[model samples]
Target: NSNICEVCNKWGRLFCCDTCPRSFHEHCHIPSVEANKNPWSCIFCRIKTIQERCPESQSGHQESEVLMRQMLPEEQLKCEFLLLKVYCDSKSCFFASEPYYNREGSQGPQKPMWLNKVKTSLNEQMYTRVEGFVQDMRLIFHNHKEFYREDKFTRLGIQVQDIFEKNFRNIFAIQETS
Candidate 1:
């Protein structure tokens, strides 16, 4: 209802997804939107449709890990697509490029990492495996916990971590059984 492009947190000719509350600028969406597409659905909704149609998971195999090998383009998109859901679901409060400035604190042992750092590092190919990527994402939450230390912000960050884990499972189709 804010009438903002939920992805980049800016304003533009948003496509305004009909199925969900999210609206997005044409270029901000994965697969990119065009003006001619009527009543658009965001990537989350579209992926959900695929999940539903198959019923059983097939998008990723049960092993659920990306290797150090250079990713084929579609694999890369699957990775970023997970980030897109985290970005939208959290509303980017925990994700601002400068959380130290926007978040109003400096009270814990910190090497200083934020969500965008993960984004760019992923873009930079700094993560050699899905474990590396997953660990870096985990590091963001750990920073919040140490810095906030039982405060409401830590709780808020936990919610974002939940979103991260949920989508990680869905996108990777990680099977949890032993």
Candidate 2:
């Protein structure tokens, strides 16, 4: 009867003032609320307890949880690219290249003319391995019906991680740390 904010229905060690008759959580007092101690409004007062709020709760109302499935194709591609960049730069593999060169001249010396000719031939045989991994993910996503029906969000997360791991390995295998 004496403890607990009548507004929020929150139990507290503090007593309520007669004017408000609302026993608020000690941290739910106005000053505390102003300092962002209580960001959520009292269930009874229905007033915003804090000024600045997270985007998800901007309206000062509780939002219903939504579970989304795999991202749209464009979004998936963007996510894959972002993950690729992270993996490429990760210190665990150290596969990234520096922006600047450390040679005596602005540009390093090129190989002999014969070496250049052989390199040109090798370039024709080189193809991006990452593209194959992306295609595999696309096929897996399209074929996995359960991912869409039951755990779309989780499945998409898994796909992203898997692609990242594959690309990282393709770029550089793990180094021994002993």
Candidate 3:
């Protein structure tokens, strides 16, 4: 797919080409369909529309790489989708919002992280690389486990954290030989 948008040539919200992997933002298209046209594609596909290439059949190629570059458009989309999914889950009520409020007050959250903070950090493009995104996520889990030492609370934290990792795996298509 066109990694950097075809129209604006920058990465952000975008629309993908039907004819090719090219991408463009809604308003930036040669023609502004920003209002709404469910089906769209880049200019190269315009004149060819009549002769229209056949609908894309799944190319049976099954290969993928680890998402190491934070600047990559695909990687950004992948991580954003993962964050959205986590927010939608029922258990997200705890982690999706701000962490336990000022029970002890100050020092706690200033030291670590939480889901909402991680998500916002991502939205604001704070992570320079993938590991930073992961590092923050891991902090949320570890912070919860270590802070709420009581059995029931700790177990609840672990349960939510467990769900996040499994979700993380499928989103990134992580594979481990070891």
Candidate 4:
């Protein structure tokens, strides 16, 4: 390989992107693939293309609303959980109004207020509708382990499951009750 793997930083048999200089180890790339005759671009490049396509003239608030609306329900739910995991892992809580609320409260972990803010902005009915879909998606993960071998994905999957189970126990309980 002419370039180092962008993931593991080791130089070895690597997949180089056609449009960019980035390279990745076969195993380091999620959904790793065998050497193919066709050209390939890395996931980072794909995301960058998406970002670049968004017009700069749009305000951040408008851009977010537009992007959120564009996501499929399942993708939106996954994105929400991923954003929360990143916040929790970074030890930063953006939803806290005051510095005191930012600290760990008597509760195990303080619930972020922004969650409610988002729900309110999306409207209660719409929020509740998507939540049911999200719960269904969660069950697929809970009942299966086929796609969770990687350490990072496994950890995040478990963490997201816990978060969903804790917050949406009522939904699960409703199913049991019915």
Q: Give the lDDT of residue 47 in candidate 1.
A: 71
Give the poorly placed runs of model 2, Cα more than 4 Å off.
7-10, 33-178
Which of the numbered candidates is closest to the native, going by highest TM-score?
1
Regions of candidate 3 where Cα sits further than 4 Å from its true position = 1-67, 101-110, 176-178
Estimate, for each residue in 1-178, the C-alpha lDDT of model 1 and write its tens digit.
Answer: 4488877778878788878888888656755675576766777677767668777655455544443434555456566787777777644565547566234555654566776777777678676556666767777777777778666767876888899888877786776654
Quantify all predictions' global Cα lDDT against the true fold.
0.69, 0.34, 0.60, 0.43
What TM-score does structure 4 among the candidates reach? 0.35
Runs of candidate 4 exceeding 4 Å displacement: 33-37, 56-178
Q: How high is each candidate's TM-score?
A: 0.64, 0.18, 0.57, 0.35
After TM-score superposition, the amount by which residue 2's alpha carbon in candidate 1 deviates from its true location, in angstroms, is 14
- Candidate 1 segments whose C-alpha is farther than 4 A from its true place: 1-11, 15-23, 30-70, 101-109
The alpha-carbon deviation from the true structure for residue 178 of candidate 4, after best TM-score superposition, in angstroms, is 46
Ranking of all predicted structures according to TM-score, beginning with the best and ending with the worst? 1, 3, 4, 2
True-structure RMSD for candidate 3 = 11.1
Q: Is candidate 1 or candidate 2 better by lDDT?
A: 1
Q: Pick the candidate with the highest lDDT.
A: 1
Error of 2 at 20 (Å): 2.6
lDDT of 4 by residue, 81-176 (tens): 333332332222323122222222222213223332343333333444444434333543343223344435445446645654543333112222
Worst 10 residues of 1 by lDDT: 62-71
